[PDB]
Design a protein around this ligand. Structure first.
Ligand SMILES: *[C@@H]1O[C@H](CO)[C@@H](O[C@@H]2O[C@H](CO)[C@@H](O)[C@H](O)[C@H]2NC(C)=O)[C@H](O)[C@H]1NC(C)=O
Length: 361
């Protein structure tokens, strides 16, 4: 079983206990740690935060304590215009330039693979994504000829049917990628006003339309399209989405005037780290959708949909019953890495959970 874990570059700038460096990672915790978001300059992979070279090294040293640990560098991301990706992938000329540039950069900095986070390709991009993947993987194999371990190639994929149908050639890329991470937590629409859970596990025997929005269908659908079950990886959020209620209505479908207030350390609207969410719970009424098997809290005019040890454990089990490769946890910096916020003196509670289940069989 695989437990891919993401670490983001910008989680170093948070204040106080919110500050997180590669340093803070249990090297034995995960099996794959993805440093989050390299970049592209002059059609070539490049750094992002000034000290990346340093964090790179801090993170890559963990392998000194656990030799079987593997690390990957991810390209793209949210703050990386998808148009930019699209532009690099259409001109075979600029695409090659990029590909050929990766191995060295990786080899140089100690990574064991690259991770494509081209965040949502267009209907006009499917054809080139495939190209990018097919060619990149090719470059990688050729490089292995040099007598060294072959680099890993993976990709962060959307779990939205339409999204998937629009720009992904699953049956294709499935054969070139080492593993596919399903973004199974961006389900609730950032477009419409209404309380809703972003990472439901199940369809929810109560709401007709949009049965395509839940982990269960995502996985099932991917499998239909051809993705081998042994290459799939279910994404598990370690954060929660906050909403500013617009009425005393707290139950399903209640009004929403906007994104909840920021977090003391997270400082961003609609997003809360698990550890922040831990503090929040105090004096908050905890609810849990039986049908979707996920929890949400409400305090004052604040409504929060999130995941806990038990919601997370479920998915972990699901993940295993369909026999998938393993799990993907978004941001170890969002989990209680210090472990001093959520009661129990445990560090990385949520991730542990996912691990514990994956390890008892
Ligand atoms: C990552 O690389 C991109 C692309 O080169 C950088 O983007 C540009 O930066 C310059 C100067 O700020 C602008 O004139 C260009 O219009 C930008 N191009 C693109 C594609 O955005 C970006 O600055 C780099 N990131 C960091 C953190 O250095």
């Amino acid at each position: 079983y695989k437990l891919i874990c993401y670490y983001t570059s910008w989680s170093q700038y948070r204040e106080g206990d919110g500050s997180c460096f590669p340093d803070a990672i249990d090297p034995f915790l995960c099996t794959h740690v993805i440093y989050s978001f390299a970049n592209i300059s002059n059609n070539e992979i490049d750094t992002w935060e000034w000290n990346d070279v340093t964090l790179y090294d801090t993170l890559n040293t963990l392998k000194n304590r656990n030799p079987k640990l593997k690390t990957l560098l991810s390209v793209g991301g949210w703050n990386f215009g998808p148009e930019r990706f699209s532009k690099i992938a259409s001109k075979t000329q600029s695409r090659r330039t990029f590909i050929k540039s990766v191995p060295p950069f990786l080899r140089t900095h100690g990574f064991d693979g690259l991770d494509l986070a081209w965040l949502y390709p267009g209907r006009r991009d499917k054809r080139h994504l495939t190209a990018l993947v097919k060619e990149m993987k090719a470059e990688f194999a050729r490089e292995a000829q040099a007598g060294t371990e072959r680099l890993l190639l993976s990709a962060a994929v959307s779990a939205g049917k339409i999204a998937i149908d629009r720009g992904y050639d699953i049956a294709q890329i499935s054969r070139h990628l080492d593993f596919i991470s399903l973004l199974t937590y961006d389900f609730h629409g950032a477009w419409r006003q209404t309380v809703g859970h972003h990472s439901p596990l199940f369809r929810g025997n109560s709401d007709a339309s949009s049965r395509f929005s839940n982990a269960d269908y995502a996985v099932s659908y991917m499998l239909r399209l051809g993705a081998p079950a042994n290459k799939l990886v279910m994404g598990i959020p370690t954060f929660g989405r906050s909403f500013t209620l617009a009425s005393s209505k707290t139950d399903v479908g209640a009004p929403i005037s906007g994104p909840g207030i920021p977090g003391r350390f997270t400082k961003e609207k609609g997003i809360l780290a698990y550890y922040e969410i831990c503090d929040f719970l105090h004096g908050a009424t905890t609810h849990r959708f039986r049908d979707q098997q996920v929890p949400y809290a409400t305090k004052g005019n604040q409504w929060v949909a999130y995941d806990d040890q038990e919601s997370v454990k479920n998915k972990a089990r699901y993940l295993k019953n369909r026999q998938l490769a393993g799990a993907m946890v978004w941001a170890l910096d969002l989990d209680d890495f210090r472990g001093t916020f959520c009661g129990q003196n445990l560090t990385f509670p949520l991730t542990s959970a996912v691990k514990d289940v994956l390890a008892r069989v």
